């Protein structure tokens, strides 16, 4: 009946890149999400499927807390049934979504003068992503049919671009740390609960 390290999931030193979006698998703990909801330090907290009030005592088998950093303007793409670069090529949410999207501005931590370029989003893909699939591939995206042979040039690109996160960015261009929770369903006993 121990507590799951929700802090680090929200408080980690530097977050992961959205294309290789980090995933924490939160299991076998007591987890009162009431504090996370009413923390009033998150600029966006949208639960899709069950409202934040009740989820405090609905009992889950296992939950996933995906985490990454995106731009603020892009947070809307983290929503079941949206389109765009972050939704199609980096992180696709299924329309039968159950968990919530928790985005909070981090212009002070994740950004820095001269830009913080450690975060990357995949800009191109020969097909859309499936729900929850992660693509770490690094093979030169071929715009035409002319083979590229693993080197950039004309009509062939590297499918990994970086955010430039300065602290003077607008609220939509500011590094938003985004933690997504998707809860699971199973006939195995519900172990994340309380």
């Amino acid at each position: 009946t121990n507590l799951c390290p929700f802090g680090e999931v929200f408080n980690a030193t530097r977050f992961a890149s959205v294309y290789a979006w980090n995933r924490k698998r939160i299991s076998n703990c007591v987890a009162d999400y009431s504090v996370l909801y009413n923390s009033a330090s998150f600029s966006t907290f949208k639960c899709y499927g069950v409202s934040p009030t009740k989820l405090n005592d609905l009992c889950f088998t296992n939950v996933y807390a995906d985490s990454f950093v995106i731009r603020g303007d892009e947070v809307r793409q983290i929503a079941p049934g949206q389109t765009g670069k972050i939704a199609d090529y980096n992180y696709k949410l299924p329309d039968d979504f159950t968990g919530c999207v928790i985005a909070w501005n981090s212009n002070n931590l994740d950004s820095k003068v001269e830009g913080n370029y450690n975060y990357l989003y995949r800009l191109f893909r020969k097909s859309n992503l499936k729900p929850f699939e992660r693509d770490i591939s690094t093979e030169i995206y071929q715009a035409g049919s002319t083979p590229c042979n693993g080197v950039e040039g004309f009509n062939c690109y590297f499918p990994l671009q970086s955010y430039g996160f300065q602290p003077t960015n607008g609220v939509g261009y500011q590094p938003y740390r985004v933690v997504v929770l998707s809860f699971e369903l199973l006939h195995a006993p519900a172990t994340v609960c309380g």
Binding site: L123, T168, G170
Partner: protein
């Protein structure tokens, strides 16, 4: 597979890299204009040529996608904006000759100076020395000296540079499959491939001549009254029937006529509206000026300035240690970074400029959801017109009463109305013949309808007949008087000012009728008019993603530049001038000379 998707993928990569390279450019240039250090000018130059080399490489990559096989005119407009390779389509020998010509001209402008023959020691740059001279002198001869000496010492240096420059610009243009460089310029107003809203690059010339046709009566009346006042100020140096001398027009060229107010004011004893003291007495600060501009904008329905605008803007001149260029300026650094740099005083003028720059910021905020290449004015004239109408409707006496800044016992009357309107006409109407005539001369020179041996000969003719202004001294074919103006010698297109003036009063009448405003168009105050807000924002949100004709129709319900709203705005002043002109000659005859005696 298809070439369309190659263009799409290309633009999708270009945007996401150009964004950050331009943001670095912008932070470096901002840090420069905020804190002038040689460290900073170096950081600035570095980021600048990084982004410039990037977009040259991207232009090269983009011209690998023929414009033929693309249907999406958004994709096609982006590919066309990028594919426009410019001087890079020339042979690097010729591009080098071009850019040394350009830099030599820019420096002959900036470092130019005129020296009195009485003292080979002390002499004057353009601003502030000569600009303030021409703006404030009431003396005929000394204004004449500033004018003629600045034209004969700085222009004659630029003449051969300008001839070689027009040759290489025409070759760069005909090498891009344009007809001339003037055609290259009017390409800003071209629309192709949209049925019913298209526009060709000569349709602009005929449209501008047509609208200027209807403006000729109002301008002739104002010109006649201004000529009357100027002769009651310059007894022996102006004729009742001739044209106005060029040096007596309040600045170096006659571009605006503002500085003639103190000579043309109708009610020279009835006071102006000058509300600086009401801001002084009530502890108004720069924060107050900009909070009131922001509130004026939220009244009409537009959003307020974002927190970054408050944190990052240089709103006051920051002391004596760190230096800054205090030109009032609105900044879209990209990446959501909207700022203002302005050394704020406590003055009515700065109070209004706050609204202007905030309108620039509101236009910028409007279209920032567009693709990067399409984040600009619908055409080259929309930004400044959007900015100017806000200044208009914030300078209104009823607006100054609604904000506690004027006493409700103030009496609006014929006197204050004709005062405001003649000042407005000095600034806004006296510039339209000038702007139209300058761009017409430039077009005719680029197309080749003037051989160089007649360059100046045509200039001062289009002055005498379009603007009713005559040069005060004969100017032979070694001058390049056009280039004594900044925008010419610095390779900037001009007709943006004509189109902007006309668009601003079109927008004004449209938003005022959406305001259910009754009474003359000048008393119109679009504040608290959410209808004017929606009608303005429907065009603002577009950027250049649509033909400027379509966006203009979104506001004024007309598809093309129109001058009825401007004459409507100046109607009261129009009829007052008609009453004042009963026994004076309206119109000018282009034969009389200042120097033919």
């Amino acid at each position: 597979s298809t070439i369309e998707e190659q263009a799409k993928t290309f633009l999708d990569k270009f945007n996401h890299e150009a964004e950050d390279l331009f943001y670095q450019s912008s932070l470096a240039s901002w840090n420069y204009n905020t804190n002038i250090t040689e460290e900073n000018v170096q950081n600035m130059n570095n980021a600048g040529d990084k982004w410039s080399a990037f977009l040259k490489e991207q232009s090269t990559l983009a011209q690998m996608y023929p414009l033929q096989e693309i249907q999406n005119l958004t994709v096609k407009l982006q590919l066309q904006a990028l594919q426009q390779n410019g001087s890079s389509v020339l042979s690097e020998d010729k591009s080098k000759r071009l850019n040394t010509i350009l830099n030599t001209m820019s420096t002959i402008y900036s470092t130019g100076k005129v020296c009195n023959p009485d003292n080979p020691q002390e002499c004057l740059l353009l601003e502030p020395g000569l600009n303030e001279i021409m703006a404030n002198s009431l003396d005929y001869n000394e204004r004449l000296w500033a004018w003629e000496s600045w034209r004969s010492e700085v222009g004659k240096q630029l003449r051969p540079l300008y001839e070689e420059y027009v040759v290489l610009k025409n070759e760069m243009a005909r090498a891009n499959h344009y007809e001339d460089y003037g055609d290259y310029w009017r390409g800003d107003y071209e629309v192709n491939g949209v049925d019913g809203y298209d526009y060709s690059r000569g349709q602009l010339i005929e449209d501008v001549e047509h609208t200027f046709e209807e403006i000729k009566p109002l301008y002739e009346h104002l010109h006649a009254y201004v000529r009357a006042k100027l002769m009651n100020a310059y007894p022996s140096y102006i004729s009742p029937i001739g044209c106005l001398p060029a040096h007596l027009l309040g600045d170096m060229w006659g571009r605006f006529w503002t500085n003639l107010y103190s000579l043309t004011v109708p009610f020279g004893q009835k006071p102006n509206i000058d509300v600086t003291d009401a801001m002084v007495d009530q502890a108004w600060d720069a924060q107050r000026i900009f909070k009131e501009a922001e509130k004026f904008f939220v009244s009409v329905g537009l959003p307020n300035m974002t927190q970054g605008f408050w944190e990052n803007s240089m709103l006051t001149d920051p002391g004596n240690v760190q230096k800054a260029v205090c030109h009032p300026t609105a900044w879209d650094l990209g990446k959501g970074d909207f700022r203002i740099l302005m050394c704020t005083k406590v003055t009515m003028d700065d109070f209004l400029t706050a609204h202007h720059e905030m309108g620039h910021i509101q236009y910028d905020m409007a279209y920032a959801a567009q693709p990067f290449l399409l984040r600009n004015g619908a055409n080259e004239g929309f930004h400044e017109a959007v900015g100017e109408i806000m200044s208009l409707s914030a300078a209104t006496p009823k607006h100054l009463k609604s904000i506690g800044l004027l006493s409700p016992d103030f009496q609006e009357d014929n006197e204050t109305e004709i005062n405001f309107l003649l000042k407005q006409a000095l600034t806004i109407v006296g510039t339209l013949p000038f702007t139209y005539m300058l761009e017409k001369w430039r077009w005719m020179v680029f197309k080749g309808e003037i051989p160089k041996d007649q360059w100046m000969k045509k200039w001062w003719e289009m002055k005498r007949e379009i603007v009713g202004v005559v040069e005060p001294v004969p100017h032979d074919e070694t001058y390049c008087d056009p280039a004594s103006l900044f925008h010419v010698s610095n390779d900037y297109s001009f007709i943006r000012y004509y189109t902007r003036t006309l668009y601003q009063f079109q927008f004004q009448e449209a938003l005022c009728q959406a305001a259910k405003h009754e009474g003359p168009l000048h008393k119109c105050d679009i504040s608290n008019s959410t209808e004017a807000g929606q009608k303005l924002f429907n065009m603002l949100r577009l950027g250049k993603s649509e033909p400027w004709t379509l966006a203009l129709e979104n506001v004024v319900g007309a598809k093309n530049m129109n001058v009825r709203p401007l004459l409507n705005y100046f109607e009261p002043l129009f009829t007052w001038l008609k009453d004042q002109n009963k026994n004076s000659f309206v119109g000018w005859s282009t034969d009389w000379s200042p120097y033919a005696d």
